[PDB]
Structure formats: structure tokens, C-alpha cells
Chain A
Amino acid sequence: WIARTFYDGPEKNYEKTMAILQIEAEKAELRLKELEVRRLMRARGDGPWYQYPTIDKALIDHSPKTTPDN
């Protein structure tokens, strides 16, 4: 009576634990991947992150400048 009224079967806890373990394992591998990606991006600078600003080339004046040799 106690088992029927207050508790459930072992399969419920078993599968819940499996789902939780899978979720946490994916989270851990994602954290490692994010750390590695951050390290590589900061070391190289070829990714969208750590793109420090540079001088815009649209500000340059392309016209004769009173002197042929610029």
C-alpha cells in the first residue's frame, strides 16, 4: 500500500538519472569547447570575438592634394 500510494517504480528514477547525466555531460563538453574556442580566438584573432577596432578606410581622401607626390 505504501509503495502504491506514495512511491513509484525504479525505472522512473533510472531514466531520470540517465537524462540528467546526459544533460550534464553535454554541458561539460560544451564548457571545455567554449574555453578552447576562446583561447584560440584570443591567441589568433581570426574569429568574431576579440575584434579590436581599427581605423576606417572610408575617411581617407582620394583626391589631388596640391602636390603630385601626396
Chain B
Amino acid sequence: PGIVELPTLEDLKVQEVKVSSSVLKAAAHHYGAQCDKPNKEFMLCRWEEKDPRRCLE
């Protein structure tokens, strides 16, 4: 019953981050210190909406 809605591929296109795990780990502390606001906003939206399709932006 019902139809599952899924965003199209054009909605999921974005410039990915093409660095490895070691590169991320080296700057992990500074990345968390600098990029805290958007990451926290996304995390709060993720735990509040409980839906991946509501947090693409």
C-alpha cells in the first residue's frame, strides 16, 4: 500500500570529497572546530526528521 518516493539522480549530484580516511583523520579536529555549524544543523535535522530524503540540502 502506497508508493515510495525517491529523489532523482539530479537531486543527489554534488561535488564529492575525494580524500582518503587518513587525510580526513589528520584534519579531523580542525575540521570539527571550523565546520561545526553546518554539520550540527545537518545532524539535528537528521535526528529530528528521521528521514534521509528530508536532509539533502
Q: What 7 new A-B contacts, CB under 8 Å, besides A68-B46, A68-B47?
A: A64-B47, A68-B49, A68-B50, A69-B50, A69-B51, A69-B52, A70-B50
A70 to B49, CA, bound (A): 11
Binary per-residue interface labels of chain B (7-23) against chain A in the complex, 1 for a CB within 8 Å, 0 otherwise:
00000000000000000
- Looking at the assembled complex, report how far the CB atom of B48 sits from the nearest CB atom of chain A, in whole angstroms: 8
B interface: dominant SS: helix
- How big is chain B's contact interface, by range? under 10
Total CB contacts across the A-B interface at under 8 A: 9
Bound complex: CA A70 to CA B31 (Å): 27
Q: What size tier do the contact residues of chain A reach? A: under 10
A64: nearest chain-B partner, CB-CB: B47
Q: How far is the CA of A14 from the CA of B46 in the complex (A)?
A: 85
The 9 residue pairs across chains A and B that have the minimum distance between CB atoms:
A68-B46, A68-B47, A64-B47, A69-B50, A68-B50, A70-B50, A69-B52, A69-B51, A68-B49
